[PDB]
Design a protein around this ligand. Structure first.
Ligand code: 7KK
Ligand code: 7KK
Lengths: 260, 258
C-alpha cells in the first residue's frame, strides 16, 4: 500500500534515531523508574553532593553548571545534525536551507529530547550517571536559576503524552523540516518532505497508540509551548551576556543564537 | 544454490538501480552519443553556476572542494539506503552497521565515481555538467592534487568494462568488510560477504565469460581503492591548514564530515 511506504519511513527514522542519539527515552525511563542496581544514578541536590558528584560522576557554581549545558548542547547539535542528514531529502536541499533548518530547529529538538530525561523531580545528566534535582537548579543565583523551570513545566505536560522513541524520531524529523523558518530560499521542497513526514507520524501514532484519541493533533499543539520556551531561553541568554561579561559562550552556539 | 546466487544478484541490481540515480549505463551514454555543459577554465566554471544550479553555492579551488563535500554527503545517504537492501545487513548489530558504512562510503564513492569519469574528465550534476581533468589539476595546491589519483584509478578500473549489474555486487562486497576497526560481531559480516563473493564470481563468469580471472582482478582493485582512500583523507588533513576559515560557519563544519 501507500502506507507500507509510511511504515518503512517510520522504521528508517527510528533506526537512524537510535544510531544518532546515545541516550534514548527507553534508557532514561529504565534509569529513572529505579528498575535495577547497575543503572542507578548519583543524585546532585546541593553543593556537597555536587562536589562529591565531580568526584564520582565524571564530567564558581551555577557557571560550572551553565558551561556543562553549553558543552552538552554542542554535543547535542552534533547528534541532531547527523540525524538530520538521515532524513530522506534533507541533504538534497539547498545548503543554505540546510544550515537554516538546523539553526532554527536545534533548540526545539534539544528541549523535546531533554523531556525524555526529566520527571517532575529533576533531570538525568552525564549519560544518565547523574541526576540533578529541580530544586537545586531553581536555587542557582539569578539569572541562572531561571533557566530550568519552564523546561520542567513543558516536560511534565509533554511526557504525559507517553510517546516512545519511535514516535519521537518522526516528531523531531517534522520539526527540522519546518518550511516557516526565516530566510528559507525554497520553501516548497521542504514542505513536501514535511508532508510525507506528517503522513508518517499520523500512521505511527495511530498504530502505536490506538486508544489515545487525537494524539496526533495534541502532539502538534505542543509546538506552542516549545517555541515559547526557546523564546524565553534566548532572552535569558541576553541577560547573561550583559551581567556575565567574564564568561565565554561556545562559537557553534553563538552562531546559532545570532538573530534569535 | 546457484539459483539463489542469481536471485541475490538480481535483487542487488534492482536495489542499486533504485538507490543511485545516474547509473553507469546512462553515464556512458552521456559521455559518447545518444549534452553536458563543459567546465574547462575559470571563466567556464563561473558560467556553469549560472548554467547548472549548484545547491551548494553560499577562491575557485575552495568552491569546487565545497561542491565535492556537498555531493559526497548526498552519496552517503544513497549508499546507506543501498546497504539496507543487502540481505542480512539490517539484522547486524546496529553499531556494526554504522561502522561498516562509516569506513566504507569513501571506497564506494570513488568506485562509482569511476562510472562518471573518462581520461578527459568527470560528469557532475546528474550529467548536466562535465569538468575537465586538465582544469582540476590546474587548481592551486593542495587542491589540484585531489583528483589526479582518482582519474588514474578510474581509467584502469573502467578498462575492466564492468556494468551496473556487476558493480551492484562489487559495491555490496566492499560494504560487508569484516576488517573494519571496531566491529563487535565479525562472523555474520564475513558470512554475508562470502555469500556476496560467490554471487559476484558467478555473475562475472556469466556476464564476462571471455574475461579470464576478472574476479581476481576486481579483488585486486579493492586494494587500489584502500590506497586511494588513505591518500585522500591524508590530503584533507593538510586541507585543515589551508581551507581553514577562522571565520567559518560551525554548522557547515558540523555538516561536513563525509
Ligand atoms: O535547562 S537549560 O535551559 N538547558 C539544558 C541543556 C542541557 Cl544540554 C542539559 O543537559 C545537561 C547534560 N549534562 C550536564 C552535565 C553537567 C552539567 C550540566 C549538564 C546539563 C540540561 Cl540539564 C539543561 C539550563 C539549565 C541550567 F541549570 C543552567 Br545554569 C543553564 C541552562 F541553559
Ligand atoms: O576527486 S575528489 O578527490 N572527490 C570528488 C568527490 C565527488 Cl562526490 C565528486 O563529484 C562531484 C559531483 N558534483 C560536483 C558539483 C560541483 C562541484 C564538484 C562536484 C563533484 C568529484 Cl568530481 C570529486 C576532489 C576533487 C577536487 F577537485 C577537489 Br578541489 C577536492 C576533492 F576532494
Amino acid at each position: 500500500p501507500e502506507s507500507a511506504d509510511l511504515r518503512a519511513l517510520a522504521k528508517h527514522l527510528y533506526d537512524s534515531y537510535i544510531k544518532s542519539f546515545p541516550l534514548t527515552k527507553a534508557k532514561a525511563r529504565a534509569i529513572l523508574t529505579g528498575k535495577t542496581t547497575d543503572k542507578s544514578p548519583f543524585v546532585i541536590y546541593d553543593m556537597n553532593s555536587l562536589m562529591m558528584g565531580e568526584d564520582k560522576i565524571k564530567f564558581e557554581v551555577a557557571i560550572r553548571i551553565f558551561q556543562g549545558c553549553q558543552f552538552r548542547s554542542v554535543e547535542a547539535v552534533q547528534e541532531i545534525t547527523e540525524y538530520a542528514k538521515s532524513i530522506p531529502g534533507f541533504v538534497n536541499l539547498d545548503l543554505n536551507d540546510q544550515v537554516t533548518l538546523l539553526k532554527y530547529g536545534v533548540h526545539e529538538i534539544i528541549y523535546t529530547m531533554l523531556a525524555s530525561l526529566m520527571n517532575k523531580d529533576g533531570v538525568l545528566i552525564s549519560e544518565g550517571q547523574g541526576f540533578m534535582t529541580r530544586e537545586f537548579l531553581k536555587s542557582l543565583r539569578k539569572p541562572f536559576g531561571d533557566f530550568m523551570e519552564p523546561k520542567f513545566e513543558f516536560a511534565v505536560k509533554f511526557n504525559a503524552l507517553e510517546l516512545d522513541d519511535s514516535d519521537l524520531a518522526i516528531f523531531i524529523a517534522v520539526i527540522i523540516l519546518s518550511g516557516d523558518r526565516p530566510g528559507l530560499l525554497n520553501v516548497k521542497p521542504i514542505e513536501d518532505i514535511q508532508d510525507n513526514l506528517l503522513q508518517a507520524l499520523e500512521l505511527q501514532l495511530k498504530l502505536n497508540h490506538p486508544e489515545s484519541s487525537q494524539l496526533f493533533a495534541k502532539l502538534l499543539q505542543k509546538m506552542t509551548d516549545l517555541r515559547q520556551i526557546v523564546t524565553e531561553h534566548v532572552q535569558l541568554l541576553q541577560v547573561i551576556k550583559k551581567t556575565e561579561t567574564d564568561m565565554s559562550l561556545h562559537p557553534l552556539l553563538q552562531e546559532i543564537y545570532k538573530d534569535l
